[model samples]
Target: KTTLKFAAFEGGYGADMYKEVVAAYEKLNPDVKIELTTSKKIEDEITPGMKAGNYPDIVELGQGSTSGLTETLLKDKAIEDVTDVLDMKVPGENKTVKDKLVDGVIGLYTNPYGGDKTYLMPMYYSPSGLVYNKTLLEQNGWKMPTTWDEMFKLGDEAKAKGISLFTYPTAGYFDAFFNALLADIGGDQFYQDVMTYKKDVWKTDEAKEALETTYKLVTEYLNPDTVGYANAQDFTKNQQSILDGKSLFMPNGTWIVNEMKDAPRTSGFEWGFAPVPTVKNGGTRYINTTIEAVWIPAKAKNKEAAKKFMAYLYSDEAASIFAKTGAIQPIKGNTDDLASDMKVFYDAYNEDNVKAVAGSFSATATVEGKNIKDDLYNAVDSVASGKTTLQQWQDKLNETSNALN
Candidate 1:
């Protein structure tokens, strides 16, 4: 019998989602045996093994994992080349895996190094932006704002109801928010400049305007409560505010629905999602995209079996099983199977003005003890806590951008 080793991090969808999919795969192919490993500390558990050349046959780690193993592989070029999977027909299905995915979901993560060739497989994709409660908006007769001015005005209005205009689970979630904001304020050229760290791109008027907008948001519009509870232990508590109707908007991905399923909420709470407000009227509505991906290590012993299993993941049966647990696949027509509440995100992603951006600056040698993302986004916390000013943040961002570039 053929055997394959598969490893996946335990994320919002949890361990059993993969376990059950593995079970289904084995049931369909009796000659194949599958060994699966999963944990919230998956990278921690598997990384050492990989170093000793005991790599799993297939892997499902992504950029979101705290341990950073997947990202490390991307940087080191240690993953197998599975680009041929695009043209290979998915086992038990009449379609290629590439034919099944929605447009715009495949580019960035798969080709992290920016060549046309891909080392990673885009698995799950979610639209990330501003999320709020629909029930609260309708109850207060407040229209969801489409522009910066309207959003700030709504923030002031929300304040009168003992609610704040915005709150976030954590500063890190702002990556998607800020990327979309960059595109909205500066258009595509400026977006590429900022993301690629083009020389002094942050010195432009668009950069200044975007920074000032974020400054005003953290200083004047964000919930004061966020300053205290934005830490690891209390981050979920901040997410709880959206359900309690104490906050009008939060920057988050579609995974929030499942992550907070068991958390308490206000009566008749309803979730609503929209791209971050535009810089001006008729500006492009940008929704930054987050994709979780799968790949194989170059040293994997069971390459052919792992390849077949990866192909099987695109089968209608496999996709159906994954969707049952709110783990949305990147496959085309998959949105039709999502719950009504979740479909709105797909609708937003599909809008003409909404641009779907994925990926980040190409990896560079780690700046000694520095994380540009944390230093930049965490300034929101410092602003709310009264430790930093907008101008200081602007200067520091420019400094860090220059250092990293």
Candidate 2:
């Protein structure tokens, strides 16, 4: 009998879905036995084993994770190239995996090496941006803003009613928000330059506009209590602020529903989602998408079986199973049957002017004492609290980019 070891990160979607998928796969290939391990701290759980030369055959972790395991592997060139898996016919299906996936899902994010080779298979995807209370907007007779001017206008109107315009779970959540905003302000190529640490990209006019806009939002419109509670332990309190009608919007993903499912809320509270407002009236708007990934390690003992399993994951049967828990895959037609709240988030892409942006900064060798993401994202807390100047933040980000480059 052949055995495959699979390790996955357990986030808001939970752990049992992985178990059910593995069980189904095992039943299909009776001769194959699968060992599954999942955790909220999957990287920490599997790191020692990996160092000891016992790598799992397949791992379901995404980049931008706090532990940076996937990024480390990419930086080290330790991931097996799985581009051919896209051409492989799905298990029990006649079509190739590439044909089954949604367009634009296999671009820069999957091809980290800047080539046609794909190291990561996109799994679950979420269109993340500003989440708010739909009922509140309807009650106030406010339309969602489509541009920054309208956004700030609404911010002023809301402030008059004692409602802050924005809050975030933590500064870390700015990854999606800032990515989409950068693209909106600078266009896609400029966004790519920043992601790949191009020289002096942060000093461009586009970069200045993005920073200036973010500064105004944080300093003028952010909830005063946000910085105090923007942490793992108390972050939900900030999200709770939206539910309690203390705030109008927060940068977040669809998972906010499940994460805050048990929290108490004001009467008639309902979830609403919107892409980042465009920088100009008719400019292209982007909804930054968060895509979770699954990949195989270079030293895995079951490469062939792992590839088969990966192909099976895109099958319609597997998509249905994952959907039961709201783990939407990137497969085409995957969103058709979603519940209303979940469907609305995905439907934002259907707008004529909105597009989806995915991926994050390119992996770089460790630069001790400097983290590019922290300088770019977490510095918002300091900026909001008056502890850091906008120019200072911009210079610090440029320095981090140069060092990493």
Candidate 3:
């Protein structure tokens, strides 16, 4: 029997689900054993071993706001190119892994080394947008906003009723919110330039417009108390404000329902989702994606076994297990298994006006204390709290872009 080291970040879905999936896989492959290790602090635990060449066969670290391991691998080009996994048949299924994944998950982050090849394989996927109380919006006869003009108008109405227009879990959540909004405002070409930090991308009128629009959210439309609960210690209070009707909307991902499952909510509250309101009256809307990635190490000992296990992970049985635990993998028609509230997310995700986007700026080896993500997202709070002007924020972004370039 061969042993494969499998390490995963224990996210909101917890570690047991992945363990069960591994158990199922082992049942199918009686001769192979998976030595599973899961931790929320996997990066801190695994990095020293990785540096010493003791790499796990498979790693399930995701591209997140503070995922140091994923960033390190991307920077060093240290992960295996698993592009061929796309072509291999999912164990016990006819479709390929590529066929199973949604269209956009395989680019950018998956190919952090660039070119046609892929390294990261998107595992669990969730849609992100404006989450609010459906029953409240309907009871008040307020139409969901499809454009910024409509959004701000509704903001005024809601404000008059003593409800703040928007709140977010933290400025870190803006990583997805701003990324999608930028893409929607500028279209794909300009979006790429901004992500890649191309020459003078931030100095353009398009970039300025996007920044200014985001500035409007902070200055004119955001909740006055949002900055107070933005810290991790009290972030759930901000989320709870959405349920309590203290705030009308918040930027969040699908995992919110499970995370807030035990929290109290107002009478008749039902979750509602909409893609970030459009810039144009009927312009395309982009729902930014949050995905967890699984990859094999370049120095993995049992490459063939790791490949087989990865294929099996996309199998129907494994996806079902993950779904039961509220970890939605990007498989076609997977929404049919979702509960009613989650089904709304699935439906919204399939809407014609909405596009799904997944990717981030490619990582590079840079000086310490020069984290691009921190420089970009941390400024969100400074803007919201009035510590920095919109122009200063824009200029700082431009400077960071050029420095990183």
Candidate 4:
């Protein structure tokens, strides 16, 4: 006899990711009345409502600002003691997500902000590393790169042929991009210290080398257009660079393919996926993967039901839709049979050539749960715009990141 009220942010997520089976859930639980709320601001945007004493029974947010929502998780004990739950399916993943889930999905959304409990449950997992035009590479006799040295050579070759080495949506990518560097620089400790803003740590050659390579890539290989476009949201403006064979690589999740799913590519523009190039044990290229996941408020009224709905999204139907959208799912091997349009882009990750590492989790437990991402992007905008030098940018980031820690 419980009436469940649910709300999710508008774009990127909506009634659609779940539209296929909402009726099925209702069919299964006839007595549990469900009301769904969808809006652009349902996650970071719903805080004011909850503050005013009005909120949905369930909430789904994709990492943008759930850090600000940590208090709610604490207040209502909103997250589950998902430690065992993750193993309920796999050691590091959420148990509920296991059934239809992909491999590596558990590492994402698995950190309970450093607690033993899993507060944020993984809803939808997206991979962000490398997306290349397979047809471009294949026709031109290009092989997916295996090492950082090879990556540089490929960039040079592509450039000589009038193609961009790589293109990215924004400088904001620095957050994960840099985090991936830390992994190559110092492994997991580098990751921990960087997020904590350990001054002495960045003072090491490790941090400098990371920024140096990043800067080199920017000047020598990164998208020439990315240097100063604050308004550019995704890679749409540069997607044509890819589709036209003007670019060889781009840093993005699975979205770009779906975003331009219908867009024309050069005849035979097959796609290829690869991990971020990593520096030699002591070198320059680095690849770390970032994940975006969904979280429910701890105080949510229908927590249990919300958990079930999450499980539904991982079900076969929703997984198919997600793959169709060009998003790489957490269910490791599931992407194998995807459309060449999507599969070609994701399949390259299957090889062990590139280094794999966890993306930089947030700087703190409260990171856009408050305004951390905003601040980070603001800095990124400044750097990419030349308003600040890389040194200045690092200092700015260090100052703010230190505060969060």
Candidate 5:
């Protein structure tokens, strides 16, 4: 009998769904035993063992994690290539895993090295943008803004009533927010150039506009308390600000519902989601989609069985089980039966002028004292708090990108 140890990050979707999927897979492959381990901080739980050369057979974490384990692995080229897993038939299903996925889900983020090989399998595809209190808008008979100009106009009006126009759980949550905004301001090619660390891309008028808009939000419209609680320890309190009607909007994903399920809320509160407002009235709007990943470590045991389990994750049976916890995989038809709250997020893509954007910066060799992600994301806190100027932030990003290049 083969035992495949699986480690997963238990985030907004919770952990039981993973256990159920493992049980279902083990039922079919009775000879295979899955020793499943999960935690809110799975990286911390597994990293010590990994450092000692005892690695899990499979890991269900994504890049851009605060822990940076996946990013470190990608930079170190320590991930096993799973491109052929796409062509493997799903257990008990007739179609190949490649045929089962939603179109455009596999790209540079999964194929980090930029060829045809996929090291990470896309797991959950979440549509992330601005989450707001819908009931507040309805009560005030206000419409959601479609353009940046309209957004600021609304911001001023909301401010008159003592509501801050924006807040974010943490500056890290800006990954999705900033990605979508960059695409909206500059179009897809510009977004691609920036993500791939194209030299001098950050110096363009488009990149500057993205930062200028961020600066305006941070300085003129953001909740004053946001920067203070932007760290991991107190980030949820910033999220709670929206529920309590102290903030009108926050950059977040669909999982906000499940993540804050039990948080106290003001009466008449209702959740609403929207794509980032466009730079112009009629410009194409973009919503950054977050795709969590599953991958195998290069040094893992039971690779063949682990690959089989990876294929099983795309099976319709397993997809159904995962969806019960609001964890939507990037499989075809995966959104059809979503709960109404979750459906609203996927439905945002159905609008004519709105588009979805995914992926992040390509991995690069380590540069001491210079992390491109930190320069781009974490600096938001400093910028918002007046500790770093927008110009400095932009310059830092360019410097880091050039160094990586």
Candidate 6:
């Protein structure tokens, strides 16, 4: 008998998925009228409303934000726990979310870090990796390499021909790279230390290996056009570069396909994806998975109704609608019909070699989000620009990491 009001963060999957969910939920629960409002990045949008004592029943913000506002919310004991909902599988989903959810990915939300879900539910499956022009590789006779050695070797060979190598928006792409890099450097345990910063972890040989290879990608194989990458960020420009054949590969995620869906329509080439290859030869492979997720604010109204709505969304009906954007949902089995570029990524996912992870260690360590990512951006940029020595840059990283922590 209670009417529920729901709010979605301004620019994300909500625009793509919410209406389908609301309309479907309406059909099933006609009596429970739902009000849906799109939000402005929710973090900036909600606090003012909260101060005025206004709160929505449900909200979706990206996962594991560092404001520690959520951490504080958890500490002050203002939030309710959705422990029961944690085990519920999406309707039409083959298994419970717990069973279907990848370990580290689920941890980002369900663990105490996010204040014990069902607060934050895993809504999307982002198989983020290297998005490339498959047709280009095939046409150029440049085979897709499976090792870092080959990736870079090809970069040199391609650059020899005057191509601009590879590039990400900035090294801040580290959120994805750090995770993926670990598989190449050491493995998950190596990644965990860097993530939570266990005892002198960054001093390890593995960390250095990751730094060495990543730095190589930046210094040796970055896009020349990046000097004038000239956008608020390079995600779009780089995607444009990929389509134009200026850049060989884009270290990106699943959102990219939809994020730049219009490009291929204009590019008229078959693009593809591949996981981060090994360290050019015998090194490991790293795959990064990140998702913008949904959660009930630590302080939300209509908690019970929020849970019901969240549970309903896990249903098959909602999961299918989510796949329309080319992102995989964490419901269990494959829902996508397997589009061109995504097919390569799905192959990696099915192999179980896929390492589930998070990014921006600077953000994870520091309470300041942009400050953290910016320092890393600066650190990598400084070195790539030859403006700072790696040693000084690394020292700055430690200094910044400690200051942010």
In terms of TM-score, the best-performing candidate is 5
Model 5, residue pairs in steric clash = none
* Candidate 6 off by > 4 Å: 1-3, 9-14, 64-80, 87-105, 108-119, 170-172, 227-234, 264-268, 335-341, 350-388, 399-405
State the RMSD for candidate 3.
2.5
Better of 3 and 6 by lDDT: 3
Q: Tens digit of lDDT per residue, candidate 6, span 1-405?
A: 677777765432437477777888878778778878764444554563364236777765553342334444543454456767767754445556566555556564344443344445665777667877778787779988877777887998898777777866645455576678775677767766555545555557776666677777877898866645623344467668887887888777776666676654324477577777766454446667666656666567677777878777667777777677765666656544665656767677664344445542422333544344444454666667767665665565555555644
lDDT per residue as tens, model 4, 1-405: 777766665433334654444555676657766776666545454553354235565565554332445434543445444343343432223445556555555542356355345655565444456777777777779887645678788888888888878766655555555656567667777776765556555457777677666655665686666554424344366666777777777666655655666778778776666666666733443455455555555446566666666555555555666555554456656655766665544454465544556533442344444444554444555554556677875565565565666
Better of 1 and 3 by TM-score: 3
Ranking by lDDT: 5, 2, 3, 1, 6, 4
Error of 5 at 336 (Å): 2.1
Top candidate on lDDT is 5
Residue-wise lDDT of candidate 3 within 76-136, one digit each (tens)? 6678888899899998778898888766677777777567888888877788888999999
For candidate 5, write residues 1-405 as lDDT tens digits: 888899998888889999999999999989998999988677764563365247888999988776878887887778899999999999988999999999999997898878789999998879998899889999988798988888899999999999999998888788898889999999999998998888899999999999998889888899999988987678889999999999998988877888899999999888998998878878999988898889998888778999999999999999888887678888988877688879678888987799989988877456778888899888988888889998899999999998887
Give candidate 1's whole-model lDDT. 0.79
Quick one: ranking by TM-score, best first?
Answer: 5, 2, 3, 1, 6, 4
**Candidate 6: worst-modelled 10 consecutive residues by lDDT:** 359-368
TM-score, cand. 3 vs. native: 0.90
Candidate 3 at 248: error in angstroms?
1.2
Angstrom error of the Cα, residue 322, model 5: value is: 1.1
State the displacement of the C-alpha of residue 346, model 5, in Å, after optimal TM-score superposition.
1.8
Local distance difference test, per candidate?
Answer: 0.79, 0.87, 0.81, 0.58, 0.88, 0.63
- What are the root-mean-square deviations of the candidates from the true structure over C-alphas? 2.6, 2.3, 2.5, 5.0, 1.5, 4.1
Instruction: Please report how far candidate 1 places residue 92 from its true position, in Å.
Output: 1.6
Model 2 regions more than 4 Å off: 364-370
